[PDB]
């Protein structure tokens with residue numbers, strides 16, 4: 001399975017779970033609300049220690065369910081385009097998950113050049129888009145639905161290889177022996193398909209979200225900006241679609257190596273993934289093939 005670390009060992013490697021940025025010499029690397037991510041060192045070996053945190057919205061039993069489900073999926077699914085779980089802690093009762101460290105952060109931050117990192121080139125964006133599609137494919141081949149595909153859950157290795165993460169809300173699918181419904185609607189609104197916002201649970205929703213990720217990649221804009229018009233990135237398909245706009249108007253200007261042909265081809269994938277009708281969307285195997293034909 002995985003290694004079982006003691007809470008005390010993890011507390012040590014993360015300097016008390018020291019909450020300052022690495023810049024000023026602390027250990028905190030990032031936060032959602034699922035938990036906080038800490039830079040760790042065990043075996044000369046740098047790691048990510050995620051300490052899960054209860055936040056008014058989840059039971060301290062629904063946060064244990066995300067814990068067990070992360071472990072449950074990471075056991076079943078090992079792939080070059082998914083993060084790697086090394087181990088876990090459950091004693092000391094913060095609950096921790098330990099991964100192989102991703103030195104290049106999230107795609108979201110790399111896209112925004114957070115803390116001053118350089119802008120990703122078109123060349124690098126293409127590899128990342130293909131990597132991400134590959135990770136998603138493996139998941140869907142293994143009858144898993146992620147339920148929260150977004151650039152923040154796409155991590156980047158020491159080679160800028162894309163790795164999908166955050167499996168705490170993943171669900172088993174099946175052959176489609178019938179439309180499956182939620183009473184607990186989860187996901188990130190700015191990346192959700194309309195059926196997922198109504199509570200359907202289907203792999204076709206991951207495809208829609210991924211299509212939003214492709215837009216971020218092309219444009220370098222986050223999916224939601226309250227201080228922008230349109231506030232939601234997805235609204236660009238319609239602008240471009242109702243000729244109020246050109247895709248070339250929105251291509252990220254912080255690249256020097258884009259070409260029209262591959263950018264349009266990436267846009268045409270994103271536009272197909274973003275069908276309002278779940279059944280008109282390409283499947284993941286189709287997205288994978290088209291992104292391959294792009295390069």
Ligand SMILES: CC(C)(C)C(=O)Oc1ccc2c(c1)nc(NC(=O)c1cccc([N+](=O)[O-])c1)n2CCCO
Pocket residue numbers: 029030031037047048050083084099100101102103104105106109115117155165166
């Ligand atoms: C040094 C620069 C180039 C600025 C940089 O990107 O630094 C980082 C910043 C943040 C970070 C970094 C690196 N790595 C992570 N997280 C992980 O390594 C990680 C690996 C595997 C799984 C998970 N996870 O949250 O499930 C998180 N994180 C945290 C979560 C993504 O921001």
